[PDB]
Design a protein around this nucleic acid. Structure first.
Ligand code: DTP
Ligand code: MG
Ligand code: MG
Length: 539
DNA sequence: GACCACGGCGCC
DNA sequence: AAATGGCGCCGTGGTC
């Protein structure tokens, strides 16, 4: 390519090099652009950023986030990663995509721009003819990247002092727990070392081993195993408490306060757009899609996530989303009738499990009930269900008998999906998002059956993802008009920030947009709450 | 210091 | 642990 002076012409493809992968924290080391047989290299990349109308290229969103960090409205445009990802969601990295579609991902901006230009050419050609993938790119993925860029740049406010205070409290309780364990062991050891724990539990103490680990064949010390051993010895219960507290301290309480951005004073995640096999987003650096919610300590952590002064959080969460999708994809009339007649399957299982009427079902019971229902749906063994519910095989068999008898045409949809996947090599969502599942014809039953479970899950999970993404696309411009913000997505939930004065309006509008995103044979239903913190906003 | 595999576990 | 699926992050034990 001819080296042309900087500034590029409109529509040029950008390439850029960051000191590190997180656009909110990175130094923009270099910036280049490519169009029509030329390459343009910025002498000063931060100043050169002002000349662009849009970020068009590989990882366009990341550059746009960094532009917003520096107060510039540079929205993301075409990204060959999004094209590769729609063709095959195993196309998740630029290293991989380049090798596949005609180049090499280097560390140099010029080359990254030229790569971006020619990869877009090649991948656009492959998507021609592929009209439904094309609709997804134009109407969902491409615009969603702009919405995510704004979410990432905005961040969420965290009560830092609270979390630091909470750390000292939890440290003390941890000391109490580890001291009891060592007493019960007759000696100290590193309780964070599962190998050392294995020896204590199974060699030194008498305790029976329940299972083995996958790769290396060690006697497992997992929560599942420890739960089964909970009466065998009093040490076990302390180990479970120790595990709870150290997980949350080490993953949430300690790291989060140190990730406050100095300019914003807020916490900034990355919403990864080409990371999953089903079309979901992921969140990383810090993952804010797995903030605790079950246990009392987890809930205390969730309270740290707060509204800006004089604003409120609005949390919107789809009700029984994948079940409703399943009713639509399958056409099971009994299951459609459940949702038209306004019944709640998670509470019905909860009342069954704990043996109490629906009026008396609490948060924990209902949560527990969700594992059971998605566990069973996506293929849990009788054996395993008998374990978690703590009942016999006969009983756990009989649960999974009725579950699927209730809803005849689910199994029929499962089989049609499996057959189509075997024939074409891929399965798809309601909108034609694909996942290639090659092992449906494997000769090893276990490999074949795992592949089957992945294959029938994807249309369901991915359709919910498609819906939520489309909902985000539609909702974002409406929020800007109202002076509200989209903060977080947690798969089937959204968290928004609204000025106090407008929070009720925002909530009503966001709920309608989410319920009417794309009507189905069953109604989509959204639960909404408003509060000063994340926990209160779904209380 | 970086990275790796693993077992383990937080959320949907 | 186990015939649920989809993620990312932590500490250990270990390499380079
Ligand atoms: N344990 C699980 N196994 C498989 N899929 C799950 C599991 N938990 C959650 N999911 C998937 C299926 C859910 O429909 C989807 C959204 O999560 P979630 O909001 O917690 O449940 P839900 O939408 O079905 O019930 P709720 O009415 O409480 O919102 O994520
Ligand atoms: Mg939900
Ligand atoms: Mg949810």
């Amino acid at each position: 390519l001819e080296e042309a002076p900087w500034p590029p012409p409109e529509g040029a493809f950008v390439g850029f090099v960051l000191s590190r992968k997180e656009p909110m924290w990175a130094d923009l080391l270099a910036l280049a652009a490519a169009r029509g047989g030329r390459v343009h290299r910025a002498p000063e990349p931060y100043k050169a950023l002002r000349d662009l109308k849009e970020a068009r290229g590989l990882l366009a969103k990341d550059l746009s986030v960094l532009a917003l960090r520096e107060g510039l409205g540079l929205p993301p445009g075409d990204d060959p990663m999004l094209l590769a990802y729609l063709l095959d969601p195993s196309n998740t990295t630029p290293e991989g995509v380049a090798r596949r579609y005609g180049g090499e991902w280097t560390e140099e901006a010029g080359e990254r721009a030229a790569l971006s230009e020619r990869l877009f050419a090649n991948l656009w050609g492959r998507l021609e003819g592929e009209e439904r993938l094309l609709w997804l790119y134009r109407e969902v993925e491409r615009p969603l990247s702009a919405v995510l860029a704004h979410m990432e740049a905005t961040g969420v406010r965290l009560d830092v002092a609270y979390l630091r205070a909470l750390s000292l409290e939890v440290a003390e309780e941890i000391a109490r727990l580890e001291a009891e364990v060592f007493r019960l062991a007759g000696h100290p050891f590193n309780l964070n070392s599962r190998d050392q724990l294995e020896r204590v539990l199974f060699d030194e103490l008498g305790l029976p081993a329940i299972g083995k680990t996958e790769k290396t064949g060690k006697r497992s010390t997992s929560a599942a195993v420890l739960e089964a051993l909970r009466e065998a010895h009093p040490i076990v219960e302390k180990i479970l408490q120790y595990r709870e507290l150290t997980k949350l301290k080490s993953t949430y309480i300690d790291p989060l306060p140190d990730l406050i951005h100095p300019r914003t004073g807020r916490l900034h995640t990355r919403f990864n757009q080409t990371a999953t096999a089903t079309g979901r987003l992921s969140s990383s650096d810090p993952n804010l899609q797995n903030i605790p919610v079950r246990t009392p300590l987890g809930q205390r952590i969730r309270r740290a996530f707060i509204a800006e002064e004089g604003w409120l959080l609005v949390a919107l969460d789809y009700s029984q989303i994948e079940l409703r999708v399943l009713a639509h994809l399958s056409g099971d009339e009994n299951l459609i009738r459940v949702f038209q007649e306004g019944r709640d399957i998670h509470t019905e299982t909860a009342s069954w499990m704990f043996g109490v009427p629906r009026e008396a079902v609490d948060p924990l019971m209902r949560r527990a009930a969700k594992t059971i229902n998605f566990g069973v749906l996506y293929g849990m063994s009788a054996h395993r269900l008998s374990q978690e519910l703590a009942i016999p095989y006969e009983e756990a068999q009989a649960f999974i008998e009725r579950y699927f008898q209730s809803f005849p045409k689910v199994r029929a949809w499962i089989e049609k999906t499996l057959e189509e996947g075997r024939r074409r090599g891929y399965v798809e969502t309601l909108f034609g998002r694909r996942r290639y599942v090659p092992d449906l014809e494997a000769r090893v039953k276990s490999v074949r059956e795992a592949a089957e479970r992945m294959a029938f899950n994807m249309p369901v999970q991915g359709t919910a993802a498609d819906l939520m993404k489309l909902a985000m696309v539609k909702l974002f411009p409406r929020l800007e008009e109202m002076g509200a913000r989209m903060l977080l997505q947690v798969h089937d939930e959204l968290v928004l920030e609204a000025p106090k004065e407008r929070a009720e309006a925002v909530a009503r509008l966001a709920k309608e947009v989410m319920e009417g995103v794309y009507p189905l044979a069953v109604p989509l239903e959204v639960e909404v709450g408003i509060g000063e913190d994340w926990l209160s906003a779904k209380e």
